[PDB]
Amino acid sequence: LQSLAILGATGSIGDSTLAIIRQHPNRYRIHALTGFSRVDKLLALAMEFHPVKICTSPDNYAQLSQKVTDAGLDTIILSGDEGLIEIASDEAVDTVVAAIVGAAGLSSTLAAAGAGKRILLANKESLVMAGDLVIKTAKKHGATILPIDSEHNAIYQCLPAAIQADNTAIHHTSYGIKKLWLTASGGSFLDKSIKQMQNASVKEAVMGQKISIDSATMMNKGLELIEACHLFDLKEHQIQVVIHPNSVVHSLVEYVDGSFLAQLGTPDMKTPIAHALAYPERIKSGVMPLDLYQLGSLKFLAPDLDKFACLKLARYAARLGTGACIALNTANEIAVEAFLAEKICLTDIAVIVKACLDDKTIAQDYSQDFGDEVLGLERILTMDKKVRKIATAKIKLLKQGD
Amino acid sequence: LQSLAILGATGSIGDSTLAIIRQHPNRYRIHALTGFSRVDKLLALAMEFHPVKICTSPDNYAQLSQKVTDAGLDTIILSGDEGLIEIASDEAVDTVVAAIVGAAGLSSTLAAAGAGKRILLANKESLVMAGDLVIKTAKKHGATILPIDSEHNAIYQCLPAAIQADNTAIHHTSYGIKKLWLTASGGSFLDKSIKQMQNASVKEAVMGQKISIDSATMMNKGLELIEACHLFDLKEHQIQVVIHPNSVVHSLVEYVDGSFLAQLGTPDMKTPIAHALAYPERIKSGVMPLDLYQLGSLKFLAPDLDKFACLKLARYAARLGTGACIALNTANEIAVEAFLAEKICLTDIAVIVKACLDDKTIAQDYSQDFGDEVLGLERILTMDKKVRKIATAKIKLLKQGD
Numbered sequence: 001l002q003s004l005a006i007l008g009a010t011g012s013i014g015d016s017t018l019a020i021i022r023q024h025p026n027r028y029r030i031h032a033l034t035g036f037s038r039v040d041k042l043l044a045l046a047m048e049f050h051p052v053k054i055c056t057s058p059d060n061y062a063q064l065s066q067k068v069t070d071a072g073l074d075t076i077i078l079s080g081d082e083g084l085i086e087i088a089s090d091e092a093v094d095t096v097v098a099a100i101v102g103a104a105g106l107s108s109t110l111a112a113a114g115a116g117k118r119i120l121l122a123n124k125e126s127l128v129m130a131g132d133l134v135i136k137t138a139k140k141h142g143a144t145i146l147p148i149d150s151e152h153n154a155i156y157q158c159l160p161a162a163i164q165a166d167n168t169a170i171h172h173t174s175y176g177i178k179k180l181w182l183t184a185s186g187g188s189f190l191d192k193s194i195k196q197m198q199n200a201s202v203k204e205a206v207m208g209q210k211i212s213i214d215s216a217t218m219m220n221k222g223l224e225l226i227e228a229c230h231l232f233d234l235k236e237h238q239i240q241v242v243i244h245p246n247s248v249v250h251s252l253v254e255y256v257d258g259s260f261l262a263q264l265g266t267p268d269m270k271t272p273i274a275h276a277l278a279y280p281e282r283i284k285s286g287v288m289p290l291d292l293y294q295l296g297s298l299k300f301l302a303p304d305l306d307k308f309a310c311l312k313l314a315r316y317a318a319r320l321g322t323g324a325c326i327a328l329n330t331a332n333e334i335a336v337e338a339f340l341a342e343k344i345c346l347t348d349i350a351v352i353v354k355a356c357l358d359d360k361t362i363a364q365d366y367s368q369d370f371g372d373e374v375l376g377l378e379r380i381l382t383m384d385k386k387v388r389k390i391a392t393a394k395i396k397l398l399k400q401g402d
Numbered sequence: 403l404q405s406l407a408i409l410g411a412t413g414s415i416g417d418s419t420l421a422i423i424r425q426h427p428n429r430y431r432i433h434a435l436t437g438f439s440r441v442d443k444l445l446a447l448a449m450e451f452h453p454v455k456i457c458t459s460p461d462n463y464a465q466l467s468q469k470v471t472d473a474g475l476d477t478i479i480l481s482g483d484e485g486l487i488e489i490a491s492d493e494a495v496d497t498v499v500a501a502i503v504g505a506a507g508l509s510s511t512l513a514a515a516g517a518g519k520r521i522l523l524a525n526k527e528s529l530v531m532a533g534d535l536v537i538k539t540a541k542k543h544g545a546t547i548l549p550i551d552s553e554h555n556a557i558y559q560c561l562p563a564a565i566q567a568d569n570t571a572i573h574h575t576s577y578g579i580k581k582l583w584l585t586a587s588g589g590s591f592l593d594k595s596i597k598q599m600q601n602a603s604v605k606e607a608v609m610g611q612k613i614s615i616d617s618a619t620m621m622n623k624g625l626e627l628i629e630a631c632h633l634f635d636l637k638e639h640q641i642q643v644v645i646h647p648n649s650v651v652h653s654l655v656e657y658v659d660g661s662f663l664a665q666l667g668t669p670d671m672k673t674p675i676a677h678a679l680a681y682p683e684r685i686k687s688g689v690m691p692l693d694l695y696q697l698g699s700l701k702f703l704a705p706d707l708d709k710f711a712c713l714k715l716a717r718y719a720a721r722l723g724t725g726a727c728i729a730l731n732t733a734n735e736i737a738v739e740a741f742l743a744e745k746i747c748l749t750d751i752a753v754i755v756k757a758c759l760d761d762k763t764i765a766q767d768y769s770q771d772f773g774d775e776v777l778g779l780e781r782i783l784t785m786d787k788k789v790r791k792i793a794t795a796k797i798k799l800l801k802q803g804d
């Protein structure tokens with residue numbers, strides 16, 4: 001079999017993954033699961049799969065330990081940064097599913113990499129924030145990364161085996177990769193006007209909120225752009241976007257003979273997770289298959305970059321390097337929270353992000369060696385900390401009109 | 403480099419192929435070209451590429467030899483069945499492009515197979531008429547077959563390398579192939595009624611007339627169905643059809659996790675031919691790439707099998723085996739000629755084909771061993787000869803009302 005650890009097990013990615021595990025008892029054993037906030041769900045999961053370890057936040061450690069004992073469970077309870085690292089570097093773990101969202105997840109993904117683990121990557125931060133470092137660390141120690149997000153996974157499925165196994169192979173001209181194409185639904189304001197977009201908020205949210213806001217601004221796709229440059233070892237000019245409201249075509253690889261290879265699917269994350277889990281093999285995933293007879297019509301159009309400024313910004317960030325990508329993201333974080341808490345207009349998200357990318361204070365730190373074996377991570381998190389301060393300030397100043 | 407022979411070099415497939423050759427002098431040398439009717443074009447081609455051999459029909463051998471001499475050309479002139487076989491089995495030929503359409507091409511494709519040649523298959527008859535024999539012969543002697551028709555080539559691109567190399571691997575469950583999907587444009591009477599379809603003829607004809615008629619009846623797709631069963635080693639139930647009027651999606655492979663892999667392209671045959679030529683490598687093909695920004699909307703719907711009876715018939719033929727497939731095709735041939743010469747209605751094509759599949763006279767020969775190393779080919783051509791007689795009779799009887 002294969003011993004698994006799911007970092008961030010109480011959300012969507014966790015549900016989908018564990019559903020497959022149930023259908024495949026004989027292939028995948030759970031060794032560890034984690035959850036920062038959702039203690040009862042974490043507990044429920046623990047009672048079901050009997051993991052050798054679990055981890056939660058520092059604040060919840062005591063309650064969780066008390067609960068774990070009140071249930072008569074053999075399971076070790078960890079907490080915080082340290083517990084994530086232990087689980088990700090554990091010698092009894094063969095495969096890690098990195099599903100923690102946010103800067104708090106980097107150290108464990110880096111750890112899985114350090115320890116040579118198979119990694120099923122399911123958060124954007126690992127490569128948006130720690131791009132060079134994650135990839136360098138994986139190569140050095142022989143980790144394997146396999147993307148789970150729908151777009152990256154489609155691209156990965158549509159690339160020849162040699163490039164799947166060694167992403168730097170994409171540069172040998174014989175494989176004839178010309179460019180990658182990311183599809184994007186255009187979010188909830190595709191058909192609405194530039195003027196209707198300056199307004200809120202249940203409208204903007206209609207399916208998690210932040211990610212749904214990112215879909216409506218198109219920051220999600222810029223982020224995926226930055227991730228793709230690292231995942232598949234390209235620069236941004238080689239990766240283009242097409243809008244595709246239906247979201248049936250998950251992405252495409254263009255080859256130099258004119259062949260576009262593409263993955264089509266439903267939204268069900270069990271498809272990409274099953275592919276990644278069983279790679280190079282395939283297994284039943286338990287999804288309701290896409291019905292080719294009921295697609296009606298798949299629309300495609302060019303992205304309106306004036307409306308979708310976050311996408312231009314992200315590409316601008318990708319050109320500059322790890323520093324501005326750190327800034328792009330952290331700023332988006334603060335700016336999205338702001339909109340959700342009704343402090344800004346939807347269109348200000350981009351105004352704010354731009355302001356931070358340009359800030360003289362932020363730029364002095366771009367030239368730093370964020371890829372460094374030894375101080376890389378410190379410098380990333382320091383940069384993250386700095387940009388929240390500035391982004392927060394920026395939101396303040398925007399409101400008065402500065 | 404790689405020595406090539408193009409059987410049937412004066413049509414579309416020939417043009418497209420030779421265009422790629424020109425862009426790639428350093429990779430592909432022409433050793434032979436053939437052409438049954440188009441003597442001057444054949445000659446023009448000969449004067450350009452300086453082939454070591456050419457072949458034409460028996461009737462045109464003399465004029466062509468005279469012309470070849472009047473041009474001061476070193477080239478050997480062959481003719482008929484024998485000349486095709488010589489070219490296809492020639493030790494100086496590494497790769498054969500089987501582009502001859504019609505029963506007259508089988509012996510040379512079998513010969514290429516017998517001699518261990520790489521074959522770029524570009525006619526339907528080889529597998530529709532000589533399915534088991536072609537595939538058995540190729541395996542025994544180590545020929546490699548690579549389809550060039552747009553649908554089969556898309557499927558082939560979308561199948562893992564091990565199944566590309568050995569089509570019987572599609573049965574190991576680890577590769578997780580669930581089913582193949584052929585796309586079909588629905589031809590020129592998709593939106594028109596069952597009643598408007600009973601009428602002709604420039605309408606039915608708006609590549610060639612026959613193939614365009616086959617598109618309008620959907621016999622082309624039934625034929626492709628039968629070919630796919632042999633190419634990819636499946637039975638017909640495992641291969642489904644979806645109508646797709648835009649013809650951007652050339653076909654899809656469905657995997658057990660819900661992943662549909664697909665090839666998108668323009669109609670330009672240089673795409674599939676370049677893929678097949680360079681396999682496993684890729685090369686520039688010289689096409690105007692598909693423009694993802696100008697697709698507007700790709701429609702998909704289920705095939706209307708009442709209107710598209712030829713498709714039901716072909717699947718019925720595929721169930722029975724090589725005999726009924728021979729009959730299906732030969733009958734279609736005669737029935738299409740008939741329509742083109744204004745002897746029948748478009749809808750009678752299916753009436754006629756059905757009549758022949760069901761004919762007691764034809765059925766006695768189904769149980770024959772059409773796959774036999776030694777008498778296989780004789781029995782196929784004999785069956786072809788027989789079905790023209792019957793189909794011709796059938797057309798006669800239909801007109802009076804019997």
Ligand SMILES: O=CN(O)CCCP(=O)(O)O
Nearest residue numbers: 150184185186187215220
């Ligand atoms: O993996 C799926 N997503 O990240 C959701 C994509 C929605 P979008 O195409 O609007 O970015």
Ligand SMILES: O=CN(O)CCCP(=O)(O)O
Nearest residue numbers: 552586587588589617622
């Ligand atoms: O490869 C190209 N063709 O076979 C033409 C397909 C037209 P159709 O889908 O109507 O059979």
Ligand SMILES: [Mg+2]
Nearest residue numbers: 149150151224
């Ligand atoms: Mg995504």
Ligand SMILES: [Mg+2]
Nearest residue numbers: 551552553626
């Ligand atoms: Mg075709």
